[PDB]
From a paper:
After optimization, crystals in space group P21212 diffracting to 1.6 Å resolution grew in polyethylene glycol at pH 5.5, and crystals in space group P1 diffracting to 2.3 Å resolution grew in polyethylene glycol at pH 8.1. The structure was solved using single-wavelength anomalous dispersion with P21212 crystals soaked in sodium iodide and refined against the native data. FusB crystallized as a dimer in the asymmetric unit of both crystal forms. The A molecule of the P21212 structure was fully ordered apart from the His-tag, whereas the other molecules displayed disorder in one or several loop regions. In the P21212 structure, we observed a continuous density across the domain interface between residues Ser15, Lys162 and Thr200 that we failed to interpret. Attempts to identify any bound ligand by mass spectrometry failed. Below, unless stated otherwise, the higher-resolution P21212 structure will be described. The two molecules in the P21212 crystal form superpose with a root-mean-square deviation (RMSD) of 0.41 Å for 200 CA atoms while the two molecules in the P1 crystal form superpose with an RMSD of 0.49 for 197 CA atoms. Beta strands S3–S5 form a non-canonical treble-clef zinc finger motif, where, in this case, a zinc ion is coordinated by four strictly conserved cysteine residues in a CXXC-X23-CX5C motif. The zinc site forms a small and rigid core that stabilizes the overall structure of the C-terminal domain and the interface to the N-terminal domain.
Residue numbers in the entry:
A (entry chain A): 10 to 222
B (entry chain B): 9 to 181, 189 to 222
The structure:
């Protein structure tokens, strides 16, 4: 049985593999290549409690300076087999998370996209909203929405930490007994699917959520 | 103070090496490796400009500090963007000439930023399973082609930008055509394109 890994761990493995390939291609310093080779081997190896023969072979191929694009493709495809994809909730569970939102519905998602997703986010332009759903560390379905500005700028996304097309996302806290609430937020990728593909550390996502208060 | 003119792919390359350096600062804990990457990055950027100025000098100084921040990076990218000569969209009359056989042809609307990062312009017409591509050759002449783009999407390295992407088989428009896999989304393709020679080689290997 293949070890199960999370989508963000797959994204991380892909990231370090591509970083290594770029070092092979463009960095002429022998000792630097060795340092990055070792770092990459460790970065990938540490994800698994347990590496099997296929991963051992992939690592061997990765550690060769003649690593090719075709070889990378094959290795990425192999690593994808280990991923447990994001599980879209049933309509009844989704509605329980957004009890005050009538008629709510999550757009269809391609299977690869669920394999790289730590959360699912979609925009409803009519209401200028982004909806976000995810599971917490206890595997409970959670959801929120906020206003997403129409203005898009270049900046680093607060969730994935990559330089991207971002918009200001503002969430209202639950309204207290006196009708008062806090409204906080920050810039995040307008396109949450691309955001998820860029997300290699899920703690960044959870930190974003917590910062909304 | 006139700004040295650079090409969109050169800006993309500069952005690429800056992000690479930041990731080394953040994740690679080896003093000598950091210094090597710092020096390479400095050289990569300096060599693109040749003629620099006080703004570039200041940007390089900030980049060379291991405390480089995201906010500083965004500021530097915005400054460097000011040096780029964007892709020039052709007038409709000129576009017509390039595609004489195609009627009612019209380029989509493109954002200003997207033109600053574009070495070519590509768009899809799903009704005909077609991708159109326009570009300027090395003699600055406007050129265009189109072909069938498969509806099948796979993960793989793009023949144009050389990055791992969502690619589809493109066949330039009986006979056998093997095709080449390229990004379905040409705007994203362009953003990933840091070496113009890869694009030209792709063109050459069609025609
Ligand atoms: Cl290769
Ligand atoms: Na990394
Ligand atoms: Na790479
Ligand atoms: Na890299
Ligand atoms: Na790269
Ligand atoms: Na590079
Ligand atoms: Na990175
Ligand atoms: Na790391
Ligand atoms: Na080039
Ligand atoms: Zn993001
Ligand atoms: Zn491409």
């Amino acid at each position: 049985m293949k070890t199960m890994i999370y989508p963000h761990q797959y994204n991380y493995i892909r990231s370090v593999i591509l970083r290594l390939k770029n070092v092979y291609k463009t960095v002429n310093d022998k000792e630097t290549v060795k340092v990055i080779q070792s770092e990459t081997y460790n970065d990938i190896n540490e994800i698994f409690g347990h590496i099997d023969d296929d991963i051992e072979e992939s690592l061997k191929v990765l550690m060769n300076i003649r690593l090719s694009n075709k070889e990378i493709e094959a290795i990425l495809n192999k690593f994808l087999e280990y991923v447990v994809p994001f599980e879209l909730p049933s309509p009844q569970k989704l509605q329980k998370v957004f009890k005050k939102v009538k008629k709510i519905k999550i757009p269809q998602f391609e299977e690869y996209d669920l394999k790289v997703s730590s959360f699912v986010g979609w925009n409803e332009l009519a209401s200028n909203r982004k909806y976000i759903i995810y599971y917490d560390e206890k595997k409970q379905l959670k959801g929120l929405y906020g206003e997403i500005s129409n203005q898009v700028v270049k900046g680093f996304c607060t969730i994935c930490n990559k330089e991207s097309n971002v918009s200001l996302f503002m969430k209202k806290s639950k309204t207290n007994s006196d009708g008062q609430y806090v409204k906080k937020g920050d810039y995040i990728c307008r396109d949450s699917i691309h955001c998820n593909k860029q997300l290699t550390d899920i703690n960044q996502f959870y930190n974003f959520i917590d910062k909304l208060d």
